Amino acid sequence: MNIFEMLRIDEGLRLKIYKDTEGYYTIGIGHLLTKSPSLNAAKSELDKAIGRNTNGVITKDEAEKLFNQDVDAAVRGILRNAKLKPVYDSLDAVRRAALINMVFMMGETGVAGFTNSLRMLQQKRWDEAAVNLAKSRWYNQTPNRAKRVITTFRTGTWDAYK
Ligand SMILES: [Cl-]
Numbered sequence: 001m002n003i004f005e006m007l008r009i010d011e012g013l014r015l016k017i018y019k020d021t022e023g024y025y026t027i028g029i030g031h032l033l034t035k036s037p038s039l040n041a042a043k044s045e046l047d048k049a050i051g052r053n054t055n056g057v058i059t060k061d062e063a064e065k066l067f068n069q070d071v072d073a074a075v076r077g078i079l080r081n082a083k084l085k086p087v088y089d090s091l092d093a094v095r096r097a098a099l100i101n102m103v104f105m106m107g108e109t110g111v112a113g114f115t116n117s118l119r120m121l122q123q124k125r126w127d128e129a130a131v132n133l134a135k136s137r138w139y140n141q142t143p144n145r146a147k148r149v150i151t152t153f154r155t156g157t158w159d160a161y162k
Contacts, residue, residue, distance in 0.1 A: 001158040003071060003097045007104060009161060010145050013063060017042055017056040021142055027056075028063030030104070031070055074100050077108040084108060087118050095121070098152040105145075106138065121153065130154040 011030030017039070020026045025033045025042035033045045043056050050062055058066075078084045078099065088099055099121075103111050112118075114136070120129035130150050133139065139146040151160040 001161055003100055004067070006097055006161060007067075007071070007101060010101065010148070013060070015058055015060065015063060017046065027058060027066075029067040029070075031066045070104060071100070074104045078103055081108050081112060083112040083118065087122050090122050092156055094156050094158065095153055098149050101149050126154050
């Protein structure tokens, strides 16, 4: 298992524009297009992202291209953030993936707000971190996914995903 597989599992693949859990326009493997309620606006963002007139539909290759970009940007985002980098640096390979997952989903800013959790992860206080991460809107709104990521942080294994 690896980060790509993990997120493919968590986000699924949709080749037509759809609304995510928050009701926002998205496509492919969890690629958010816009927070705007306008479908046209979404269609617009899509064409710009893909480079062609899509009419709201893309191919598997186009979706994976977006995915590659999105994973790369998240890693790079972590590495550039003062609050995140040190945490990431301190962790093992599996747990790093967990951190990437969260950032992909919520943005670096969002993740940087889990100060307490971050500190706990940095101290390798697994169980405490897991409990703290659960006290969040994130967990309450998307419990299944949140549980998998949390288990990953708690155990340092891919069990949640097998
Ligand atoms: Cl979920």
